[PDB]
Design an enzyme around this catalytic site. Sequence first.
Site, PDB file in Angstrom:
ATOM      1  N   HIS A 197       0.804  -1.235   0.000  1.00 16.48           N
ATOM      2  CA  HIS A 197       0.000   0.000   0.000  1.00 16.48           C
ATOM      3  C   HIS A 197       0.834   1.281   0.000  1.00 16.48           C
ATOM      4  O   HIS A 197       0.245   2.368  -0.086  1.00 16.48           O
ATOM      5  CB  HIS A 197      -1.039   0.033   1.111  1.00 16.48           C
ATOM      6  CG  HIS A 197      -0.467   0.106   2.494  1.00 16.48           C
ATOM      7  ND1 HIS A 197      -0.363  -1.021   3.284  1.00 16.48           N
ATOM      8  CD2 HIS A 197      -0.030   1.174   3.198  1.00 16.48           C
ATOM      9  CE1 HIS A 197       0.153  -0.612   4.434  1.00 16.48           C
ATOM     10  NE2 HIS A 197       0.369   0.698   4.433  1.00 16.48           N
TER      11      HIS A 197
ATOM     12  N   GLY B 247       2.634   5.482  10.923  1.00 16.22           N
ATOM     13  CA  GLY B 247       3.983   5.288  10.420  1.00 16.22           C
ATOM     14  C   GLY B 247       4.601   3.951  10.802  1.00 16.22           C
ATOM     15  O   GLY B 247       5.752   3.701  10.450  1.00 16.22           O
TER      16      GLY B 247
ATOM     17  N   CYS C 168       3.573   0.894   9.805  1.00 20.77           N
ATOM     18  CA  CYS C 168       3.502  -0.156   8.780  1.00 20.77           C
ATOM     19  C   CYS C 168       4.887  -0.589   8.289  1.00 20.77           C
ATOM     20  O   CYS C 168       5.783   0.238   8.150  1.00 20.77           O
ATOM     21  CB  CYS C 168       2.599   0.259   7.626  1.00 20.77           C
ATOM     22  SG  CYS C 168       0.841   0.215   8.044  1.00 20.77           S
TER      23      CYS C 168
HETATM   24  C1  LIG Z   1       0.340   1.954   8.357  1.00 19.33           C
HETATM   25  O1  LIG Z   1       1.419   2.609   9.023  1.00 19.33           O
HETATM   26  C2  LIG Z   1       0.076   2.708   7.055  1.00 19.33           C
HETATM   27  O2  LIG Z   1       1.179   2.688   6.161  1.00 19.33           O
HETATM   28  C3  LIG Z   1      -0.911   1.953   9.237  1.00 19.33           C
HETATM   29  C4  LIG Z   1      -0.669   1.491  10.674  1.00 19.33           C
HETATM   30  C5  LIG Z   1      -1.823   1.867  11.616  1.00 19.33           C
HETATM   31  C6  LIG Z   1      -2.015   3.343  11.815  1.00 19.33           C
HETATM   32  C7  LIG Z   1      -2.210   3.401  13.206  1.00 19.33           C
HETATM   33  N1  LIG Z   1      -1.979   2.287  13.913  1.00 19.33           N
HETATM   34  C8  LIG Z   1      -1.668   1.312  13.017  1.00 19.33           C
HETATM   35  O3  LIG Z   1      -1.411   0.132  13.248  1.00 19.33           O
HETATM   36  N2  LIG Z   1      -1.978   1.178   8.616  1.00 19.33           N
HETATM   37  C9  LIG Z   1      -3.059   1.751   8.070  1.00 19.33           C
HETATM   38  O4  LIG Z   1      -3.328   2.949   8.196  1.00 19.33           O
HETATM   39  C10 LIG Z   1      -3.957   0.827   7.250  1.00 19.33           C
HETATM   40  C11 LIG Z   1      -3.665   0.978   5.754  1.00 19.33           C
HETATM   41  C12 LIG Z   1      -4.385  -0.028   4.869  1.00 19.33           C
HETATM   42  C13 LIG Z   1      -3.748  -1.420   4.975  1.00 19.33           C
HETATM   43  C14 LIG Z   1      -4.409   0.465   3.422  1.00 19.33           C
HETATM   44  N3  LIG Z   1      -5.359   1.078   7.543  1.00 19.33           N
HETATM   45  C15 LIG Z   1      -5.875   0.801   8.742  1.00 19.33           C
HETATM   46  O5  LIG Z   1      -5.207   0.334   9.668  1.00 19.33           O
HETATM   47  C16 LIG Z   1      -7.290   1.175   8.940  1.00 19.33           C
HETATM   48  C17 LIG Z   1      -8.198   1.775   8.097  1.00 19.33           C
HETATM   49  C18 LIG Z   1      -9.422   1.935   8.839  1.00 19.33           C
HETATM   50  C19 LIG Z   1     -10.695   2.456   8.554  1.00 19.33           C
HETATM   51  O6  LIG Z   1     -10.856   2.912   7.274  1.00 19.33           O
HETATM   52  C20 LIG Z   1     -12.093   3.557   6.936  1.00 19.33           C
HETATM   53  C21 LIG Z   1     -11.658   2.508   9.556  1.00 19.33           C
HETATM   54  C22 LIG Z   1     -11.405   1.955  10.808  1.00 19.33           C
HETATM   55  C23 LIG Z   1     -10.147   1.454  11.124  1.00 19.33           C
HETATM   56  C24 LIG Z   1      -9.171   1.447  10.134  1.00 19.33           C
HETATM   57  N4  LIG Z   1      -7.866   0.997  10.184  1.00 19.33           N
END
Ligand SMILES: *[C@@](O)(CO)[C@H](C[C@@H]1CCNC1=O)NC(=O)[C@H](CC(C)C)NC(=O)c1cc2c(OC)cccc2[nH]1
Lengths: 301, 299
Positions: free
Chosen positions: A40, A142, A144
């Site tokens: 992503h 950040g 991920c």
């Molecule tokens: C990564 O760092 C993005 O690169 C991120 C990690 C999270 C942010 C905060 N705490 C973490 O563990 N992951 C995300 O933001 C992912 C990205 C996806 C795989 C494309 N998305 C989510 O974790 C996410 C999206 C949503 C959402 O929508 C609408 C609604 C509720 C929860 C939620 N989590």
Amino acid sequence: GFRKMAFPSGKVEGCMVQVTCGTTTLNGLWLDDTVYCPRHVICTAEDMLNPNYEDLLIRKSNHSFLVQAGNVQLRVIGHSMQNCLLRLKVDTSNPKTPKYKFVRIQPGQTFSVLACYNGSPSGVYQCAMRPNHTIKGSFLNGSCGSVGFNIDYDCVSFCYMHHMELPTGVHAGTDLEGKFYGPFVDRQTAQAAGTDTTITLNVLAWLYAAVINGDRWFLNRFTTTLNDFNLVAMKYNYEPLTQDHVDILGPLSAQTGIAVLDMCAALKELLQNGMNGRTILGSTILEDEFTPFDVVRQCSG
Amino acid sequence: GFRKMAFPSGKVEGCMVQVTCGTTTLNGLWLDDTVYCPRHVICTAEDMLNPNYEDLLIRKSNHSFLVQAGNVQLRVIGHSMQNCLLRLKVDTSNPKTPKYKFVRIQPGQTFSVLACYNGSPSGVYQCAMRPNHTIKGSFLNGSCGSVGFNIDYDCVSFCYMHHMELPTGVHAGTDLEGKFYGPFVDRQTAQAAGTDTTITLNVLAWLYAAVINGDRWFLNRFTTTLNDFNLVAMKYNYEPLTQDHVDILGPLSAQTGIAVLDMCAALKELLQNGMRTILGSTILEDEFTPFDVVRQCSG
Ligand SMILES: *[C@@](O)(CO)[C@H](C[C@@H]1CCNC1=O)NC(=O)[C@H](CC(C)C)NC(=O)c1cc2c(OC)cccc2[nH]1
Ligand SMILES: *[C@@](O)(CO)[C@H](C[C@@H]1CCNC1=O)NC(=O)[C@H](CC(C)C)NC(=O)c1cc2c(OC)cccc2[nH]1
């Protein structure tokens, strides 16, 4: 004493890099001449709601990716998709690459997490793969691309790469082949996990660890059959204990002189009566994220 | 949620060595061309019962010490004792020496411990220095010389070097100048720690952490003086607050808009009237400092 303990993270710190595509930045894992990272990173905020990853990746070139190991830029000379990960080939090999393997961890097993931000290691803690395939971690924006691992005789077994935080605050990610643990998908949606259960084998290992360290108030003169224990355990949303799991507890049983089924009878009493203000190893709840191996390693070496 | 998290240990792993005298082996810390280790490495098992360290060190030479980074020997070219530590000068300056400082931590402060055996790092975990100057660690035979530390902006602040397990199972050690935390001494005797108390500063940090997450039921319409709070807290086996503790709470107080003394009044009511849940248990947590809370809430 007895504490939740992570593996020393040095071998993993030397592999963490930062990966950037446009305005999206996350962590990557640099092993030999490959950088692994969540796919992503190629998405914009608009792409993330319903990304056609193959379609988005074919529109990218090698120079689209900025990879940085500290202040040093690594040139990407190839890229390919590995399920929910990208594999970026770089023109230089990481001299700090440890001896490693990629493994797919099973529910109930534990691993250490090295939480990273902008390619910089920030913290290290222990997690368990839940029966519902989530992990109860601590990750912020950040994080991920942060990884989970175990260490055995200077060999790092990588088992987790971080991708998501569910609405409930638990986490979801993939193995290093890019396959998610659980029914999760890398799209920007609110996702719920299946109902979680308690890891019974780990609760029993933790009660044995409590006996090894002086806590034995919860013991009793009673016993149970494996089936009668399993009926009560299932009633309380605990996993059933198999004969293989009873065998795993053999060493801890022989060490303390407490038969496995006698410890099951103590746990059955704890589930039915409660702890009633008392503590076990300092905790007021039954802890299920220590495996029998984690207990043996911490008490015996 | 909150959990114990250790600093990444790599910068410290690169400094761990083993030090042996005869058959007595323990860990050492190699920074530049000096190796620091517990001075009891010069003792046989029988010598530890009642040692005269000054007399035992007179008969030790530089050639008596075996210092190894893995199985590679580092030749000792000087030695001196500094309190309960030995400082061994070696012929090689450690290339992996991080930017570092030696600090003496105060009760209530947290730090990461890298448990080591035979100079080999085995595990990492977070400890709090208890008000009774002990730590609730996890250490086995061969763990002496393991260190505790904090990392701030790639600078490692070393604060603890391991020496003893008390009869109650808690642990005791020194700072990196060899001065014990607490009234303990390095001899093979059963030593008792004073009765422990709750770390007030960290319980307040935990209350601020609860407020940051929207759990604010326990806040009230009153305040207290620091002296009135200290006098009541001691009746509940809580530590008195110092001016430094109030200062350390500055950032959390500014972030939530709750004055430190207004939070002490909320804690005073919780102590005198009991608890309902907070984050979301009935027991107050005292091993997360104001820095730990900021690190896990803000990042
Ligand atoms: C990564 O760092 C993005 O690169 C991120 C990690 C999270 C942010 C905060 N705490 C973490 O563990 N992951 C995300 O933001 C992912 C990205 C996806 C795989 C494309 N998305 C989510 O974790 C996410 C999206 C949503 C959402 O929508 C609408 C609604 C509720 C929860 C939620 N989590
Ligand atoms: C060091 O590894 C020795 O180099 C060792 C670490 C402990 C062993 C097990 N767990 C540990 O934390 N420390 C000791 O063995 C020290 C040595 C002293 C400082 C010379 N001794 C003790 O910790 C000790 C001795 C006694 C005792 O005697 C008699 C009675 C009761 C407890 C006790 N602890």
